[PDB]
Amino acid sequence: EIVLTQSPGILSLSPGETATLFCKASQGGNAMTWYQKRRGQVPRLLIYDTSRRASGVPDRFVGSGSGTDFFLTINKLDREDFAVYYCQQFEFFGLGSELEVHRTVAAPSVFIFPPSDEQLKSGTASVVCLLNNFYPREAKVQWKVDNALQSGNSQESVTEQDSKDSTYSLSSTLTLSKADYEKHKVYACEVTHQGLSSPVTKSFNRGEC
Amino acid sequence: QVQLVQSGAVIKTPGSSVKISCRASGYNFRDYSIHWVRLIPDKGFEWIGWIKPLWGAVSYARQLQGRVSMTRQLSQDPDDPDWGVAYMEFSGLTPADTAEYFCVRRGSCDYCGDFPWQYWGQGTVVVVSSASTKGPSVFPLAPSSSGGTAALGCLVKDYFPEPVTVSWNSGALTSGVHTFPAVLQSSGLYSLSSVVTVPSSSLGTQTYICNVNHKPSNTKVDKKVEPKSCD
Ligand SMILES: [Cu+2]
Ligand SMILES: [Cu+2]
Ligand SMILES: [Cu+2]
Numbered sequence A: 001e002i003v004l005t006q007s008p009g010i011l012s013l014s015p016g017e018t019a020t021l022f023c024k025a026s027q028g029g030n031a032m033t034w035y036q037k038r039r040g041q042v043p044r045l046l047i048y049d050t051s052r053r054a055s056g057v058p059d060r061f062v063g064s065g066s067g068t069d070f071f072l073t074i075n076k077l078d079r080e081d082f083a084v085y086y087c088q089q090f091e092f093f094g095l096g097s098e099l100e101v102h103r104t105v106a107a108p109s110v111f112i113f114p115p116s117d118e119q120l121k122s123g124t125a126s127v128v129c130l131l132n133n134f135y136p137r138e139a140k141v142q143w144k145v146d147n148a149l150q151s152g153n154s155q156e157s158v159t160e161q162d163s164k165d166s167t168y169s170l171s172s173t174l175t176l177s178k179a180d181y182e183k184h185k186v187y188a189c190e191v192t193h194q195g196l197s198s199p200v201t202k203s204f205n206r207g208e209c
Numbered sequence B: 001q002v003q004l005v006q007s008g009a010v011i012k013t014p015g016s017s018v019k020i021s022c023r024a025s026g027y028n029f030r031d032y033s034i035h036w037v038r039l040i041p042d043k044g045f046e047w048i049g050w051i052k053p054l055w056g057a058v059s060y061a062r063q064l065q066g067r068v069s070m071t072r073q074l075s076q077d078p079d080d081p082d083w084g085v086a087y088m089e090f091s092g093l094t095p096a097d098t099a100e101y102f103c104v105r106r107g108s109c110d111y112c113g114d115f116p117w118q119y120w121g122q123g124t125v126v127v128v129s130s131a132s133t134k135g136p137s138v139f140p141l142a143p144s145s146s147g148g149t150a151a152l153g154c155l156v157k158d159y160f161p162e163p164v165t166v167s168w169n170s171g172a173l174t175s176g177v178h179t180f181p182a183v184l185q186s187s188g189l190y191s192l193s194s195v196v197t198v199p200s201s202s203l204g205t206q207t208y209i210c211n212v213n214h215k216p217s218n219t220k221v222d223k224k225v226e227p228k229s230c231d
Helices: A177-183
Strands: A004-007 A010-013 A018-024 A033-037 A044-048 A061-066 A069-074 A084-089 A097-102 A109-114 A124-134 A140-145 A156-157 A168-177 A184-191 A200-205 B003-006 B010-012 B018-027 B034-040 B044-052 B057-060 B070-072 B083-090 B099-106 B117-120 B124-128 B137-141 B149-159 B165-168 B177-179 B191-201 B208-214 B220-224
Touching: A004 A084, A010 A018, A018 A084, A018 A097, A044 A061, A044 B117, A061 B010, A069 A084, A084 B044, A109 A184, A109 A200, A109 B149, A124 A140, A124 A177, A124 B137, A124 B149, A124 B191, A140 A156, A140 A168, A156 B083, A156 B177, A156 B191, A168 B191, B003 B099, B003 B117, B018 B034, B018 B099, B018 B124, B034 B070, B044 B070, B044 B083, B057 B117, B057 B220, B137 B220, B149 B208, B165 B191, B191 B208
Parallel strands: A010 A097, B010 B124
Antiparallel strands: A004 A018, A018 A069, A033 A044, A033 A084, A061 A069, A084 A097, A109 A124, A124 A168, A140 A184, A156 A168, A184 A200, B003 B018, B018 B083, B034 B044, B034 B099, B044 B057, B070 B083, B099 B117, B099 B124, B137 B149, B149 B191, B165 B208, B177 B191, B208 B220
């Protein structure tokens, strides 16, 4: 079988700059194919036969390489070019390289929300931590319950990159039984991010306004 | 104009099979191989197989052998060869098969083979789950107990299947809103939250209502979000 290894996993650039994406094949001498998949859109053939442009593909896309080492270059990239790019040989695919928009570092504003009294009546407590309008997307959210670090009982969700300001937002939801929720007092979300000189904690005390 | 049009999204129970259609037009259907490929969350593309419509010859991915059955319907009038329908039936489904499935076809290159896919169907989402349809419970994410920026929201919990739509104040509030992609919980039910940031000074003057719609259960909820009642 053939293995195709793409790099980098994520490339962060601005419109007008030039993007270089790499796809390495485990076997030499086969032609390379590239696809573009914009978020939520049908995949699109970009390059075939290593350097040939598919229908409607502008000349700023350049496919190149040979042997085992293949490249997709996007010259003076357009805002429409932020997407995931995949290489292919026969039935075999790379795992994709994502082109995302670079911007200045932005620390997240952080908010914590207690479970509502309505939900608690049902036997479950959801505690939510919001990280708003930050860049880059990498962030660490740690839940603490009376300073005990939580593991295995939270789920995160991250928005698509904002089309105007290029930031991300993120939620983390901690799920507890009502019984467990009522056993402890201090509920805290600790956030680590490149824009923060030290981690930021937001917290509330159960039963306290 | 080559066109490939697939059947719609579907929910399937574990152990069942799904038959997806690919209605082709704009070229002689008997003369090109139709391929199938799926895009799997966290794993990428996986080629499924191909079918050559003339005689129905097929080739399936070795690791999927037994799970795949491709068939086709040909035009029976030789006056009218430029359409056909290809089918891909995928059996023994498990939640790992939740993915977006595509019929694809090569372009104009006569020497490049059948794998460089110029033409794509629009995709068919298949969700494999044992869960039953269920409308969401909507709970407030209440603004923290200033004059500055406050955050508030709605937690939309325990619904199946996707999707839910959320608006604020019947679409009058859009700036600062973030409606997060849903997460699948260990229960097999989805959950998401929708939040908005606003000036703190507006919390006593402005009403904030999230409008939650879950068409699969025809659930519609309007939840007013306000500061929690304190002593
Ligand atoms: Cu483009
Ligand atoms: Cu405690
Ligand atoms: Cu925001």
